[PDB]
């Protein structure tokens, strides 16, 4: 039977400094015991000084990032180019995620 | 009484549908365009009036392609012309999806015909303000067509419509009479450039830009392509030379 | 568009009246008159068949009095066809009530529902109202014998005696003159016949031009009975009351 | 007050002007057609007039093949004529699919007539300015001619004619049957029936025909087909050697 | 005449005109002037913002559709919002599904087709706004003129609005000049600000009254208001 | 399950209903009133699936109160029980059925007689002298079959209930935290605040 | 008749135009914006002395940082307010912040042209335009104190001061002369109270008029009668001082 | 597109008249005459087959139609409207009755359904009333033989005998002089042929006249045998010949 | 599918169908309401164009939306039913979700909204009805009286009237109702209400129904006598002068 999920592995780490913050993640992407790519970026710059990573099932991680980036884009269009504070981006991502409460994005996301 | 000309699907006492007749008036008011069926393809040409110097030359293309083998040109309300092509494109996609083979020109013709005719059945829509000359090459030959706002259409040896439709038709008839065996793809292209120049007299106030396209089994492999560069300039001269 | 032909059946007049309802009432006022007289031990329904012929079959007939429930019946004034549409939905409402509560539908609830349906055609939908006025005669264990009336407007009211259709102004006056609270069914059966007999637009008031019904509680039982008089029964009672 | 002439609703006289006017539209093409029944075939004839020298004479037709067995000729504007032909073809296809046999000529006629009746009653649909003559060699009724109009009316015919000069063709044909005393053309070959059609067509219209002034359709057991300019020319010659 | 055929967009006049569309075109000319012009590296939009009282703001007339596309309006503001917003999606769609920036010429075809639909069906109404689209794509700099009639035309320059005829003549005269103002943004804008002022009459373009947008080779579509336009006045 | 008892005496209907509300390992409440008043002379007790229980009860209550206002009259207990059954019988074949069992006790002011209706979640209705839902009936029906008489007073009825409740408290696995008793008669619905030791 | 969303030969929308005529008949409402907050005032205008004046709600709160006043067919404002409040609350739920006064206004204005018997563009189901105008006044971190005029046309302007209603052209004239970029909240209150008094038929008092403001500190508040009564008295005195 | 005619086309006039119903009745008046007579053991319905061209074949056009094996119909007015009414009528007989009770509906009931169809065409949006008046004759076990008339308004009444169309008034009179409650079926067939003669101007024979009856069961017309309770249809159309034979004794 | 815009703006800024709806109210029977210090009373005149009715069953002019709130009206009767039903349903729904019966302001605001909705929705005409809604908020003893009209506008009144001759009876009330001192008695409050209806009912003991609503769902309708008694005492106050 078709299983809509998979696990591409990888790992991501985030630490916040007093006037800075870091978000890292290995670049290895896999499937079972094989390696799909030794270099497949997993942490992104989404604008407004926000970095984001949705690790777990790559296809889901990609869709989420993509959607959030598009979120920022329309935030500007609809609110006079206002900058999306990080706490606002967080609440927005919650709705993006909960929106699929019954068919979850199989990812642990960090920003 | 009267008022028969105020609603679209209404029959007048003489069995006419005035609103469709009024759409024609909008077509006769537009630029002139033509189609010349040749021995193994068809050629399309149109007059593109240059409103001013500010128009970017060669940038406001009017001739349209349907699928990969059909060409469409039209006179009248341009937006309506597009709407009709958009539909033509879907109609073609649908036919190819189910039957595999690309849509035969005759078949494509009727698809447009029924859609246009449909817009003369209800008073909640307006008839199309365009006449359309289209055609291409298929399983068996080349086909040229012209579709009126009434939804009426027929196959033609040559066809024209627009402001200078009569000048054009005069020229076309001569061609038919003076070339009984058939015209060639190469020939029809030039000839077309000439008819356009001649028919431009009925609008000789504004300067114009020429546009040709063709579909020939031997010359374009049965695919619709626009005439550009050398072949285009060659036809421009052939005309500019015969207009004097 | 179509807006051109929309009569706008549900709009107000500068005076605040509903055109169609008013005109529908005007229509009713030409239909065979129908009387409703409520006694202490029963109810009477009398109606005059508008237009008749020797060949008109009166035995297999029913154009004014209809049985809704086992305890409710109505007298119709207006478009018979419209009436049936309403009657049928009223017969359904009665059963849904019974299936839901295992009790017969109280007279007013059935009347209000039907009136609400009429009211609807008065405020939305752009359809013409029903050219019908009803006299409801029924019984329930809360108010006993009841008599109601409903017209095209969707408005309804209760009465001791009432009439709908033609000559109601004359009819209401006569009833209001000889009616008395203590009356007995048979007294009403005569008041009903006398009144029609004086307002009829016909020569004589023969049996073949009438429909009669009573809702009595035949003492020798303890339940309620609906009697729809047969031609012969009307001919008799028409002679007893001294109208021969 | 004055709109009872724009939509299909009754006029005080109890008439439907839009339906009458739609009838007017059927003569707009100034063409005449006629159908007759052979012993075991049906032949239709229809004037062909190609005024413009720029037209492709081969695409100018008012005769249609609805099914392997039914043919239909139309009297009215080509756009409505094609709308009707398409719907008829579809109706015929579907009928075969659902009931397991070819839709009979008369049944397709009734169906189309019913569809037309609806444009007569529903306000948003306009009648089609056309008259449809259906022909075939039905497997149960034999040679058949059924015609429907914008009123939603239809009936079978021993023979018929439609167009501006429809009346002369009809009385001509009537007179010929008053003579022969049979309701058809006593001939075994369709070629002769086709000739009778062209002949009596000429006599009534008082006009001679060249191979491109006509359009012929023939229906035979299990097949309906149209003739070519050449098949017609061959027919035209045969008649020439009798007069 | 006209009176009987201007009841709605679905009606053709005896001469073949669509009056409702013609009336919409009129709301455009009654609108404030805006200008468009492009070189081979940049495309510029200049617009005159109109205000109500001296207590009211100056209603914007420039909208960004994507990082490489935008437009100026003349006519009903709401209609420009609806149209620009539709254009914003089309652009966004092209990005997400094909990871491709939308061709300016195509944005035009899209607009034209959207407009046309409101001129053939009952109940609708033509859009009552004119638009000037500029952008830089895989084929260079671009300028488009959009008319509610559904007509979209690619030009080197042009203007719409009241007295727009002035600027339009100036540009038709200055053509050979500005079309070669490549690699020099500041100049193309000045050429536009001189074309615009060729339609002034009432007042003179002030700081909170002028509006300018630009896009090109290495310039993302950006708008300038207030003090930012001061150096061009 | 919970305890839902109902006994119809000479001039009234008495309803006894457990006060415990247990979720898993804990008794979240020991003073729950598993009853709703549908009208001044009609009371309904209920037991079953967690959410469905109160939701359905309150839903029925709303409808009968709406009927009362619209008609300025009170439906007979019989009419009410028929409406309640019809609702359950609809739910039984729906996407997500209400899993609720109810007892409708009311005093018909028209016939001046108390009435008790038992309806399970399937829409199975039946009128009885006494009834119960769930495992309750298994211990109580034999006691009532024995000590019940049609002329009993409200007082005898309460003793008979007490008898049932004690039996339930001796043989049943669950500690249902006692009951809440209510009486429906010609004078409406009243609660016996003292049954914790009556 | 003729389409409800039809163009006049001058290029205007008939229904929207007539819509405005209805607003001209409405009770006056004025708004003044200062760097200390925005003030909104309205003419109650009871149609009979038996009508309890404080049941007249022409000044309403959208959110804690946004309030607004209406003029014209007030009943048509109810759903616009509802839409506005929802937009505000909703925006906060999605972004954990306050909706910008301009954004809130734009959203309300979007409802404006959603009318017609079937305009091909979406699903604008509403038989006619709104017959009321709104003065939306609030504060946000990006653009501070703001006053907006939202019309049934669908467009909105930002005003330093603005009046709508029967005495609008009159009061607007006054506001043109009284307003300056440095008015204090106290000045603005009086200034609104003063210009209202001029255009009202009735002798303005704390019963046929109502005040309110929005300040970054305490948000939007509606001045109760006692507070307004004094501001009215304080005004009568400064005028009697020259 | 889409039928934007969701409103009524038949409405009340200040006087109280419903214009379109009136006009539809006017259409019926112009229609060819048709009649129906009820005897003690059957009913007869008849009309004139007005051929619209000698080339047309009048058999291919029936004005007398079978609705159920014991019910037939005839009309006056607009033929096409009748045709579609007949299809709908035959169908509603099944869907609203046979498919539920396993037996054909009694005459009054099917009439009621037909009348409903027509009533709706009087009030629904975007339509005109039917331009016909019908005469339905049938028989059922508990009601016996019956005759009904349905008007464009959707109203219907039971008759002993009546006529509709052109010379309805003249024929309704003639029928009143020749009708009595003892007529045998053959008698009514006679009275019918006579009443119809006054309405027909030209050829009056079995090919210009269409006539059918509701009488005894026709086991020979059933098509099969083996079910005792299935005895055949009571509706029978007289043949061109059967008519001429009776025309001689006219 | 019928969505014709029936309520639209005319050149002068009026919506004629709403205005004509108001004319329907002017034609309705008169209705008045006056709030005392501990009660509210609603009076309604009864037509006489036709008399011979059955008052037991004929729908009365005052209706209970809930046990603590009542509503009276002037205009088309059929229309008022549709509004009463919606109001009643909303009453129960509010109790079910808020677990508290509706306040009078709330119920009024709901009824008004429905009325307003019908003034700008395609395919429908406005309600030819104007209403008076009165009662007492839950657990509150301050009387409430409100009025709604076809347009959807609503507000509270110390006393108010609608219907035919409301113009006259309002005059009476304006110069007979002292806000300073409201009818501090159920009795004198009913008196004031009958007094005002007499200015227009022209001798009608059986043409004047009255309902009295006191705090905590205490509503009751007076009988002819009890009313006729007030009629008697009032006609004396006149002759005794």
Domains and CATH numbers, chain C: 1-244 (3.60.20.10)
Of the candidates E101, E91, E103, which has an alpha carbon nearest to the alpha carbon of residue E65? E91
Gap between the Cα atoms of G171 and G169, Å rounded: 6
Chain C residue closest in CA terms to E10: C1
Gap between the Cα atoms of A48 and F109, Å rounded: 74
Residue D79: in which H helix or E strand, if any? helix D78-99
Of the candidates H161, H207, H217, which has an alpha carbon nearest to the alpha carbon of residue H188? H161
Residue A26 to chain G, least CA–CA distance (Å): 30
- The answer for residues whose C-beta is within 8 angstroms of residue H88's C-beta and 6 or more apart is H114, H117
Q: In chain H, where are the structural domains located? A: 1-250
Considering only CB atoms, C124 lies closest to which of I23, I26, I123, namely I123
- The answer for residues whose C-beta is within 8 angstroms of residue F152's C-beta and 6 or more apart is F9, F10, F160
Give chain C's end-to-end CA distance (angstroms, integer): 62
Gap between the Cα atoms of D163 and D33, Å rounded: 6
Q: So what's the architecture of F1-198 in CATH?
A: 4-Layer Sandwich (3.60)
- Dihedral sign of CA atoms I150, I155, I156, I159 in order: negative
Q: CATH for H1-250?
A: 3.60.20.10
Gap between the Cα atoms of E127 and E148, Å rounded: 5
- Residue from H2, H14, H24, H80 to probe the interface with D (highest D Cβ count within 10 Å): H80
Gap between the Cα atoms of I41 and I34, Å rounded: 6
Query: DSSP 3-state assignment of F106?
Result: strand
φ and ψ at D19, to 5 degrees? -75, -35
- The answer for residues whose C-beta is within 8 angstroms of residue C236's C-beta and 6 or more apart is none
**Domain G1-242 fold:** 3.60.20
Experimental method: X-ray
Q: Count CB atoms within 10 A of the CB of residue D28.
A: 18
- Write the residues followed by a gap in chain E (C–N more than 2.5 A): none
Of the candidates D147, D154, D76, D144, which has an alpha carbon nearest to the alpha carbon of residue D117? D154
Considering only CB atoms, G117 lies closest to which of E20, E123, E126, namely E123
Q: So what's the architecture of E1-233 in CATH?
A: 4-Layer Sandwich (3.60)
> Would you list the DSSP string of D16-42?
-HHHHHHHHHTTTT---EEEEE-SSEE
Residues of chain E with Cβ-Cβ distance to A66 below 8 Å are 96
Number of H helices, E strands in chain F: 4, 12
Classify burial at A29, counting beta carbons within 10 Å of its beta carbon; exposed 0-12, middle 13-18, buried 19 or more.
middle
Q: To the nearest 10°, the Cα dihedral for H114, H119, H120, H126?
A: 120
Gap between the Cα atoms of C27 and C30, Å rounded: 6
- The answer for residues whose C-beta is within 8 angstroms of residue E38's C-beta and 6 or more apart is E44, E134, E141, E142, E143, E156, E157, E179, E188
The distance from CA A41 to its chain's CA centroid, rounded to whole angstroms, is 11
Query: DSSP 3-state assignment of A40?
Result: coil
> Would you list the DSSP string of chain C?
--GGG---TT-B-TTS-BHHHHHHHHHHTTS--EEEEE-SSEEEEEEEPSS--TTB-STT--SSEEE-SSSEEEEEEE-HHHHHHHHHHHHHHHHHHHHHHSSPPPHHHHHHHHHHHHHHHHHBSS-----EEEEEEEEETTTEEEEEEE-TTS-EEEBSEEEESTTHHHHHHHHHHH--TT--HHHHHHHHHHHHHHH-SSSS--GGGEEEEEEE--TTTSS-EEEE--HHHHHHHHHHTT--
Q: How do D131-138 and A12-16 pair as beta strands?
A: unpaired
Which residue do the tokens 């002395």 mark?
A: G49
Q: Which domain holds residue D143?
A: 1-243
Gap between the Cα atoms of F53 and F56, Å rounded: 6
Count of residues making up chain A: 111
Of the candidates E27, E16, E106, which has an alpha carbon nearest to the alpha carbon of residue B80? E16
Those chains having 3 or more beta-carbon pairs within 8 angstroms of chain E are A, B, C, G
- Residue E115 is given by DSSP the state H
C198 reaches H (C-beta below 8 A):
no
CA atoms within 13 A on the CB side of C206: 11
Query: DSSP 3-state assignment of B54?
Result: coil
Q: Which CATH superfamily is domain I1-241 in?
A: Aminohydrolase, N-terminal nucleophile (Ntn) domain (3.60.20.10)
Residue B133: in which H helix or E strand, if any? strand B130-138
Residues of chain I with Cβ-Cβ distance to H4 below 8 Å are 1
Residues of chain I with Cβ-Cβ distance to H11 below 8 Å are none
- Dihedral sign of CA atoms C31, C32, C33, C35 in order: negative
φ and ψ at C236, to 5 degrees? -65, -70
Gap between the Cα atoms of H124 and F22, Å rounded: 59
Interface residues from chain D to C (CB-CB < 8 Å): 3, 6-7, 123-124
Do D151 and H80 count as a contact with CB atoms less than 8 A apart? yes
Query: DSSP 3-state assignment of B164?
Result: coil
Query: DSSP 3-state assignment of G210?
Result: strand
Which residue do the tokens 């993006």 mark?
A: A96
Interface residues from chain D to B (CB-CB < 8 Å): 2, 5-7, 17-18, 21-28, 53-56, 58-60, 77-80, 82-83, 86, 124-127, 129
Structure tokens at C235: 């001919």
Residues of chain H with Cβ-Cβ distance to I1 below 8 Å are 3-4, 6, 125
Query: DSSP 3-state assignment of F96?
Result: coil
CA distances from G164 to F30, G40, G170, G171 (A): 62, 11, 10, 9
Those chains having 3 or more beta-carbon pairs within 8 angstroms of chain A are E, G
> Would you list the DSSP string of E16-82?
S--HHHHHHHHHHHTSPPEEEEE-SSEEEEEEE--BSSSSB-B---EEEEETTEEEEEEE-HHHHHH
Chain H residue closest in CA terms to B9: H1
Helix axes B185-198, B165-178, angle to 10 degrees: 150
Report whether H131 contacts D117 (CB < 8 A).
Answer: no
- The answer for residues whose C-beta is within 8 angstroms of residue I69's C-beta and 6 or more apart is I91, I102, I104, I107, I133, I134, I135, I136, I213
Gap between the Cα atoms of H33 and A32, Å rounded: 89
Query: DSSP 3-state assignment of D224?
Result: strand
Report whether D39 contacts B32 (CB < 8 A).
Answer: no
Query: DSSP 3-state assignment of D177?
Result: helix
Gap between the Cα atoms of H192 and C198, Å rounded: 40
Structure tokens at F115: 């009435």
Output the domain CATH number for residue D87: 3.60.20.10
CA distances from D42 to A31, D37, D211 (A): 74, 4, 20
- The answer for residues whose C-beta is within 8 angstroms of residue G232's C-beta and 6 or more apart is G193, G204, G205, G206, G209
Whether D and I touch, i.e. at least 3 CB pairs below 8 A, reads as: no
Report whether I154 contacts G78 (CB < 8 A).
Answer: no
**Domain B1-244 fold:** 3.60.20
Structure tokens at G49: 């002395």
SS (H, E, C) chain I: CCCCCCCCCCCCCCCHHHHHHHHHHHCCCCEEEEECCCCEEEEEECCCCCCCECCCCCCCCCEEEECCEEEEEEECHHHHHHHHHHHHHHHHHHHHHHCCCCCHHHHHHHHHHHHHHCCCCCCECCCCEEEEEEECCCCCCCCEEEEECCCCCEEEECEEEECCCHHHHHHHHHCCCCCCCCCCCHHHHHHHHHHHHHHHHCCCHHHEEEEEEECCCEEEECCHHHHHHHHHHHHHHHHCC
The distance from CA H57 to its chain's CA centroid, rounded to whole angstroms, is 21
Q: In chain F, where are the structural domains located? A: 1-198
Q: What is the largest CA-CA distance in chain C?
A: 67
Report whether B196 contacts B47 (CB < 8 A).
Answer: yes
Residue D229: in which H helix or E strand, if any? helix D229-240
Structure tokens at C186: 């048979």
Report whether E96 contacts E118 (CB < 8 A).
Answer: no
Report whether H63 contacts H50 (CB < 8 A).
Answer: no
Gap between the Cα atoms of G46 and I158, Å rounded: 13
What residues are paired with G140 via a beta bridge?
G144
G11: left (phi over 0), alpha (psi -120 to 50) or beta: left
Residue I32 to chain G, least CA–CA distance (Å): 12
Residue A15: in which H helix or E strand, if any? strand A12-16
CA distances from E170 to E198, E205, E213 (A): 7, 17, 20
Ranges assigned E (strand) in chain G: 29-34, 37-43, 59-63, 66-72, 132-140, 144-150, 156-158, 161-164, 209-215, 219-222
F24: left (phi over 0), alpha (psi -120 to 50) or beta: left
Residues of chain B with Cβ-Cβ distance to H2 below 8 Å are 124
Report whether D219 contacts D40 (CB < 8 A).
Answer: no
Of the candidates G69, G65, G37, which has an alpha carbon nearest to the alpha carbon of residue G171? G69
Gap between the Cα atoms of G97 and A89, Å rounded: 11
> Would you list the DSSP string of chain H?
------SBSS-B-TTS-BHHHHHHHHHHHHSPPEEEEEETTEEEEEEE---S-TTB-GGG--SSEEEETTEEEEEEE-HHHHHHHHHHHHHHHIIIIIHHHSSPPPHHHHHHHHHHHHHHTTTSBTB---SEEEEEEEEETTTEEEEEEE-TTS-EEEBSEEEESTTHHHHHHHHHHH--TT--HHHHHHHHHHHHHTT--S--STTTEEEEEE-S--GGGSS----TT----SEEEPPHHHHHHHHHT-
Report whether G61 contacts G220 (CB < 8 A).
Answer: yes
Report whether I127 contacts I21 (CB < 8 A).
Answer: yes
Catalytic machinery residues of B: 31
Report whether I195 contacts I234 (CB < 8 A).
Answer: yes
Q: Count CB atoms within 10 A of the CB of residue C96.
A: 11
Considering only CB atoms, F70 lies closest to which of I88, I95, I96, namely I88
Residue B28 to chain E, least CA–CA distance (Å): 9
Residue F105: in which H helix or E strand, if any? strand F100-108
């Amino acid at each position: 039977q078709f299983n809509p999920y998979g696990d591409n592995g990888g790992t991501i780490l985030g630490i916040a400094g007093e006037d800075f913050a870091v978000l890292a993640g290995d670049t290895r992407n896999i499937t079972d015991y094989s390696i799909n790519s030794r270099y497949e970026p997993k942490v992104f710059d989404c604008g407004d000084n926000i970095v984001m990573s949705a690790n777990g099932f790559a296809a889901d991680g990609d869709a989420l990032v993509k959607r959030f980036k598009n979120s920022v884009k329309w935030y500007h269009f609809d609110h006079n180019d206002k900058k999306l504070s990080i706490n606002s981006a967080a609440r927005n991502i919650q709705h993006l995620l909960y929106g699929k409460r019954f068919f979850p994005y199989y990812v642990h996301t960090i920003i | 009484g009267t008022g028969y000309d105020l609603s679209n699907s209404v029959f007048s006492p003489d069995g006419r549908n005035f609103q469709v007749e009024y759409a024609v008036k909008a077509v006769e008011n537009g630029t002139t365009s033509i189609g010349i069926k040749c021995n193994d393809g068809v050629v399309f040409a149109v007059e593109k009036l240059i409103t001013s110097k500010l128009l970017v030359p060669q940038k406001n293309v009017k001739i349209q392609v349907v699928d990969r083998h059909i060409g469409c040109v039209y006179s009248g309300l341009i937006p309506d012309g597009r709407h009709l092509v958009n539909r033509g494109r879907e109609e073609a996609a649908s036919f190819k999806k189910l039957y595999k083979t690309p849509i035969p020109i005759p078949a494509f013709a009727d698809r447009l015909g029924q859609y246009v005719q449909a817009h003369t059945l209800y008073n909640s829509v307006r008839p199309f303000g365009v006449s359309t000359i289209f055609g291409g090459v298929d399983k068996n030959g080349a086909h040229l067509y012209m579709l009126e706002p009434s939804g009426s259409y027929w196959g033609y040896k040559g066809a024209a419509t627009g402001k200078g439709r009569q000048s054009a038709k005069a020229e076309l008839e001569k061609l038919v009479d003076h070339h009984p065996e058939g015209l060639s793809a190469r020939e029809a292209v030039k000839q077309a450039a000439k008819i356009i120049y001649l028919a431009h007299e009925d609008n000789k106030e504004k300067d114009f830009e020429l546009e040709i396209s063709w579909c020939s089994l031997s010359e374009t492999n049965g695919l619709h392509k626009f005439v550009k560069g050398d072949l285009l300039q060659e036809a421009i001269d052939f005309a500019q030379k015969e207009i004097n | 568009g179509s807006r051109r032909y929309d009569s706008r059946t549900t709009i107000f007049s500068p005076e605040g009246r509903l055109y169609q309802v008013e005109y529908a009432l005007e229509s009713i006022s030409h239909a065979g008159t129908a009387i409703g007289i409520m006694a202490s031990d029963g109810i009477v329904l009398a109606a005059e068949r508008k237009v008749t012929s020797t060949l008109l079959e009166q035995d297999t007939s029913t154009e004014k009095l209809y049985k809704l429930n086992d305890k409710i019946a109505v007298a119709v004034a207006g478009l018979t066809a419209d009436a049936e549409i309403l009657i049928n939905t009223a017969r359904i409402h009665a059963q849904n009530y019974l299936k839901t509560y295992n009790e017969d539908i109280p007279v007013e609830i059935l009347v209000r529902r039907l009136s609400d349906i009429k009211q609807g055609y008065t405020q939305h939908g752009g359809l013409r109202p029903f050219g019908v006025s009803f006299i409801y005669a029924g019984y329930d264990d809360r108010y006993g014998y009841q008599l109601y009336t409903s017209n095209p407007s969707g408005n309804y009211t209760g009465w001791k005696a009432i009439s709908v259709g033609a000559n109601t102004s004359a009819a209401q006056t006569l009833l209001q003159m000889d009616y008395k609270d203590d009356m007995k069914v048979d007294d009403a059966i005569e008041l009903a016949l006398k009144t029609l007999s004086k307002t009829t637009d016909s020569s004589a008031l023969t049996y073949d031009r009438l429909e009669f019904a009573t809702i009595r509680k035949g003492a020798n039982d303890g339940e309620v009975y609906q009697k729809i008089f047969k031609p012969q029964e009307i001919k008799d009672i028409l002679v007893k009351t001294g109208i021969t | 007050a004055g709109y009872d002439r724009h939509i299909t609703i009754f006029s005080p006289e109890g008439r439907l002007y839009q339906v009458e006017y739609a009838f007017k539209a059927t003569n707009q093409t100034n063409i005449n057609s006629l159908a007759v029944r052979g012993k075991d075939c049906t032949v239709v004839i229809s004037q062909k007039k190609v005024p413009d020298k720029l037209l492709d004479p081969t695409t100018v037709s008012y005769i249609f093949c609805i099914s392997r067995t039914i043919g239909m000729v139309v009297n009215g504007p080509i756009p409505d004529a094609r709308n009707a032909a398409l719907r008829a073809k579809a109706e015929a296809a579907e009928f075969r699919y659902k009931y397991g046999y070819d839709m009979p000529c008369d049944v397709l006629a009734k169906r189309m007539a019913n569809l037309s009746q609806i444009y007569t009653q529903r306000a948003y649909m306009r009648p089609l300015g056309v008259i449809l003559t259906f022909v075939s060699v039905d497997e149960e009724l034999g040679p058949s001619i059924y015609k429907t109009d914008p009123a939603g009316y239809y009936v079978g015919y021993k023979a018929t004619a439609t167009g501006p000069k429809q009346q002369e063709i009809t009385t001509n044909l009537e007179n010929h049957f008053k003579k022969s005393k049979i309701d058809h053309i006593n001939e075994e070959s369709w070629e002769k029936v086709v000739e009778f059609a062209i002949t009596h067509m000429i006599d009534a219209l008082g006009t001679e025909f060249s191979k491109n002034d006509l359009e012929v359709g023939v229906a035979t057991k299990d097949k309906f087909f149209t003739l070519s300019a050449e098949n017609i020319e061959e027919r035209l010659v045969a008649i020439a050697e009798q007069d | 005449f006209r009176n009987n055929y201007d009841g709605d967009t679905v009606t053709f006049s005896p001469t073949g005109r669509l009056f409702q569309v013609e009336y919409a075109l009129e709301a455009i000319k009654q609108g404030s002037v805006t200008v468009g012009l492009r070189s081979n590296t940049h495309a510029v939009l200049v617009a005159l913002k109109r205000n109500a009282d001296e207590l009211s703001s100056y209603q914007k007339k420039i909208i960004k559709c994507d990082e490489h596309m935008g437009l100026s309006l003349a006519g009903l503001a709401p209609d420009a919002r609806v149209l620009s917003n539709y254009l914003r999606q089309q652009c966004n769609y092209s990005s997400l599904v094909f990871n491709r920036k939308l061709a300016v010429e195509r944005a035009g075809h899209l607009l034209c087709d959207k407009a046309q639909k409101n001129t053939q069906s009952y109940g609708g109404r033509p859009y009552g706004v004119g638009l000037l689209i500029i952008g830089y794509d895989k084929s260079g700099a671009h300028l488009l003129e959009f008319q509610p009639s559904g007509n979209v035309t690619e030009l080197y320059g042009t203007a719409i609005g009241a007295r727009s005829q002035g600027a339009k003549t100036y540009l038709e005269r200055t053509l050979d000049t500005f079309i070669k103002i490549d690699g020099n943004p500041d100049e193309l804008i000045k050429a536009g600000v001189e074309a615009i002022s060729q339609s002034l009459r009432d007042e003179s373009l002030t700081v909170d009254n002028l509006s300018i947008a630009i896009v090109g080779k290495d310039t993302p579509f950006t708008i300038y208001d207030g003090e930012a336009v001061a150096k061009y006045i | 399950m919970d305890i839902i008892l109902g006994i119809r005496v000479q001039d009234s209907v008495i309803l006894a209903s457990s006060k415990a509300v247990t979720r898993g390992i804990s008794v979240l409440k020991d003073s729950d009133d598993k009853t709703r008043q549908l009208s001044p002379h009609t009371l309904m007790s209920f037991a079953g699936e967690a959410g469905d229980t109160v939701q359905f009860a309150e839903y029925i209550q709303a409808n009968i109160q709406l009927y009362s206002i619209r008609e300025d009259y009170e439906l007979s207990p019989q009419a009410v029980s028929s409406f309640v059954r019809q609702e359950l019988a609809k739910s039984i074949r729906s996407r997500r059925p209400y899993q609720v069992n109810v007892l409708i006790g009311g005093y018909d002011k028209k016939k001046n007689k108390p009435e008790l209706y038992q309806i399970d979640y399937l829409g199975t209705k039946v009128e009885l002298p006494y009834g119960a839902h769930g495992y309750s009936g298994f211990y109580t029906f034999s006691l009532l079959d024995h000590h019940y008489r049609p002329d009993m007073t409200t007082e005898e009825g309460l003793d008979l209930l007490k008898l049932c409740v004690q039996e339930l408290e001796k043989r049943m696995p669950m500690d249902f935290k006692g009951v809440i008793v209510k009486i429906v008669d010609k004078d409406g619905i009243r609660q016996v605040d003292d049954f914790q030791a009556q | 008749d003729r389409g409800v969303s039809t163009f006049s030969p001058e290029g205007r929308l008939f229904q929207v135009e007539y819509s405005l005529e209805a607003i001209k008949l409405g009770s006056t409402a004025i708004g003044i914006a200062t760097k200390e907050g925005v003030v909104l005032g309205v003419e109650k205008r009871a149609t009979s002395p038996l009508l309890e004046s404080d049941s007249i709600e022409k000044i309403v709160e959208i959110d804690r940082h946004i309030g607004c006043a209406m003029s014209g067919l007030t009943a048509d404002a109810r759903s616009m307010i509802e839409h506005a409040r929802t937009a505000a609350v909703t925006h906060n739920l999605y972004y954990d912040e306050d909706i910008n006064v301009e954004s809130l206004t734009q959203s309300v204005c979007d409802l404006a042209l959603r009318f017609g018997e079937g305009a091909s563009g979406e699903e604008r189901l509403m038989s006619r335009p709104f017959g009321v105008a709104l003065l939306i006044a609030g504060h946000d971190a990006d653009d501070g104190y703001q006053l907006f005029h939202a019309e049934p046309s669908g467009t909105f302007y930002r005003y330093n001061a603005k009046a709508i209603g029967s005495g609008s052209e009159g009061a607007q004239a006054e506001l043109l002369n009284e307003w300056h970029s440095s008015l204090t909240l106290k000045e603005a209150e009086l200034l609104v109270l003063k210009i209202l008094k001029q255009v009202m038929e009735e002798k303005l008092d704390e019963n046929n008029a109502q005040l309110s403001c929005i300040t970054k500190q305490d948000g939007f508040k509606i001045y109760d009668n006692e507070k307004t009564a004094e501001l009215i008295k304080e005004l009568k005195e400064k005028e009697a001082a020259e | 597109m889409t039928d934007r005619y969701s409103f009524s086309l038949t409405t009340f006039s200040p006087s109280g008249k419903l214009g379109q119903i009136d006009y539809a009745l006017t259409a019926v008046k112009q229609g060819v005459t048709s009649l129906g007579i009820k005897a003690t053991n059957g009913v007869v319905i008849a009309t004139e087959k007005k051929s619209s061209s000698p080339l047309a074949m009048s058999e291919t056009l029936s004005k007398v139609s079978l609705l159920t094996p014991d019910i037939g119909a005839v009309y006056s007015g607009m033929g096409p409207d009748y045709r579609v009414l007949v299809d709908k009528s035959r169908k509603v007989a099944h869907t609203s009755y046979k498919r539920i009770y396993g037996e054909y509906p009694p005459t009054k009931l099917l009439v009621s359904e037909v009348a409903k169809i027509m009533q709706e065409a009087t009030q629904s949006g975007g339509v005109r009333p039917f331009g016909v008046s019908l005469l339905i004759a049938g028989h059922d076990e508990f009601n016996g033989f019956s005759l009904y008339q349905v008007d464009p308004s959707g109203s219907y009444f039971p008759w002993k005998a009546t006529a509709i169309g052109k010379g309805s008034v003249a024929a309704k009179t003639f029928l009143e002089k020749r009708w009595n409650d003892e007529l045998e079926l053959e008698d009514a067939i006679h009275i019918a042929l006579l009443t119809l003669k006054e309405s027909v101007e030209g050829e009056f024979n079995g090919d210009t006249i269409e006539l059918a009856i509701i009488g005894d069961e026709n086991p020979d017309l059933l098509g099969y045998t083996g079910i005792p309770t299935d005895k055949g249809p009571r509706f029978r159309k007289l043949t061109s010949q059967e008519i001429n034979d009776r025309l001689e004794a006219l | 599918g019928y969505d014709r815009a029936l309520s639209i703006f005319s050149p002068d800024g009026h919506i004629f169908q709403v205005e004509y709806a108001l004319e329907a109210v002017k034609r309705g029977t008169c209705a008045v309401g006056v709030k005392g210090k501990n009660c509210v009373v609603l009076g309604c005149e009864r037509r006489s164009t036709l008399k011979l009715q059955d008052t037991r069953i004929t729908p009365s002019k005052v209706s209970k939306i809930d046990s603590h709130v009542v509503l009276s009206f002037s205009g088309l009767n059929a229309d008022s039913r549709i509004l009463i039903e919606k109001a009643r349903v909303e009453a129960q729904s509010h109790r079910l979700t808020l677990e508290d019966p509706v306040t009078v302001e709330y119920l009024t605001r709901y009824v008004a909204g429905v009325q307003q909705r019908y003034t700008q929705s395609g395919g429908v005409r406005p309600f030819g009805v104007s209403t008076l809604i009165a009662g007492f908020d839950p657990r509150d003893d301050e009387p409430k009286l409100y009025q709604t009209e076809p347009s959807g506008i609503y507000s509270s009144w110390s006393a108010q009237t609608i219907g035919r001759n409301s113009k006259t009876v309002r005059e009476f009330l304006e110069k007979n109702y002292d806000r300073k001192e409201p009818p501090a008695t159920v009795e004198e409050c009913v008196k004031l209400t009958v007094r005002s209806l007499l200015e227009v009912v022209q001798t009608g003991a059986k043409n004047i129904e009255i309902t009295v609503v006191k705090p905590d769902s205490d509503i009751v309708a007076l009988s002819s006598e009890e009313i006729n008694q007030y009629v008697t005492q009032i006609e004396q106050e006149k002759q005794e002068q």
